[PDB]
Each structure stands twice: as C-alpha cells, then as structure tokens.
UniProtKB/Swiss-Prot annotation:
GO biological process: eosinophil chemotaxis; epithelial cell differentiation; innate immune response; macrophage chemotaxis; monocyte chemotaxis; mononuclear cell migration; mRNA processing; negative regulation of endocytosis
Molecular-function GO term, any one: disaccharide binding
Protein name: Galectin-3
Keyword Phosphoprotein attached: yes
Positions contributing to a beta-D-galactoside binding: 69-75
Job description of the protein: Galactose-specific lectin which binds IgE. May mediate with the alpha-3, beta-1 integrin the stimulation by CSPG4 of endothelial cells migration. Together with DMBT1, required for terminal differentiation of columnar epithelial cells during early embryogenesis. In the nucleus: acts as a pre-mRNA splicing factor. Involved in acute inflammatory responses including neutrophil activation and adhesion, chemoattraction of monocytes macrophages, opsonization of apoptotic neutrophils, and activation of mast cells.
Chain's gene name: LGALS3
Keyword field: Acetylation, Cytoplasm, Differentiation, Disulfide bond, IgE-binding protein, Immunity, Innate immunity, Lectin, mRNA processing, mRNA splicing, Nucleus, Phosphoprotein, Repeat, Secreted, Spliceosome
Phosphoserine modifications at: 76
Subunit structure: Probably forms homo- or heterodimers. Interacts with DMBT1. Interacts with CD6 and ALCAM. Forms a complex with the ITGA3, ITGB1 and CSPG4. Interacts with LGALS3BP, LYPD3, ZFTRAF1 and UACA. Interacts with TRIM16; this interaction mediates autophagy of damage endomembranes. Interacts with cargo receptor TMED10; the interaction mediates the translocation from the cytoplasm into the ERGIC (endoplasmic reticulum-Golgi intermediate compartment) and thereby secretion.
Gene Ontology CC entries for this record: cell surface; collagen-containing extracellular matrix; cytoplasm; cytosol; extracellular exosome; extracellular region; extracellular space; ficolin-1-rich granule membrane
Ranges of residues in domain Galectin: 6-136
Amino acid sequence: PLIVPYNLPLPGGVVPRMLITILGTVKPNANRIALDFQRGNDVAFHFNPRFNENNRRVIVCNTKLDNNWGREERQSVFPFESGKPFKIQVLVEPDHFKVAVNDAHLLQYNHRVKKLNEISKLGISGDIDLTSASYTMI
Ligand SMILES: CN(C(=O)[C@@H]1O[C@H](CO)[C@H](O)[C@H](n2cc(-c3cc(F)c(F)c(F)c3)nn2)[C@H]1O)c1cc(Cl)cc(Cl)c1
C-alpha cells in the first residue's frame, strides 16, 4: 500500500498519450477524495469527489492560479461508492485531461494551464486506502 497524502512526480510535466492510473479502495464513511495535478504552487487540474455536499454526491473540478480557485466544473455522475475498490485513469489529451473511473468514461477537463511540461506533480489525498499510482505512454 501507499501512504496518503501521496506525491507522484511527473518528470518534465504531462504530455498527450500519457496515461496515469490510480488504484485504491474508498474508505467506509468517506467524505472526499482529491487528485491535484500541480504546476508549482498552481493546481492545473483538481479532481475532487465529494461524498456529502448538502447530502449529495458530486465531483468538483477546478484550477487554482496564484492561490485563487477559478470557476468550478460540476459532474452529476458519481461512480465512487464508500468502502469499494476503484480505478481512476487520467489520460492526458491535446486539449483536456480525460477521466475514466472503473473503465467507464466520466469527464473531460479542458487545459486552463497551457504549459503541460510544467505540470510536474500529481498529489493524491483523501478518504482512500491507496494501492498504486503510476503512469505509462500509450
Ligand atoms: C467552498 N469552496 C471549496 O470547498 C473549495 O473548492 C475548491 C474547488 O473549487 C477545492 O475543492 C477546495 N479544496 C478541497 C481540498 C481537499 C483537500 C484534501 F486534503 C482532500 F483530501 C480533499 F479531498 C480535498 N482542498 N481544497 C475547497 O476548499 C471554495 C470554492 C471556490 Cl471556487 C473558492 C473558494 Cl475561496 C472556496
């Protein structure tokens, strides 16, 4: 297993055709999970499942620039379930990050941070038992 919060360096940033795979299990009674692709202190892509936001389950996506969050992108579809194993796959594409959960397409997030070669970290945080975090070129 891996220790959470987890820091996975992405040497030289991300590039199109780069596939990142996170394997884990959501804790029972989980409240939140967050993936943070970072460009220094900026968060290029924050992918944040929320298990209880006003008693609803929602995925919140955003970008943080100079310490300020931007305009959120919300997804009704919520594939996660407390206490169950999951797989998140983030495929870096020319115009967006493509997220699939448990082999099902979930969302696309357009690149607001254009310097892909500077998004050199993925942080993994939240109410999970983290099993594996890696990348490969497809
Ligand atoms: C109300 N409000 C929010 O709730 C913020 O929305 C942001 C996305 O828009 C981030 O999700 C922020 N966030 C989550 C986490 C986090 C940390 C962990 F360690 C986790 F394990 C985890 F799962 C998640 N860290 N930061 C969240 O505070 C907010 C919104 C805007 Cl747009 C502006 C402001 Cl000023 C506040």
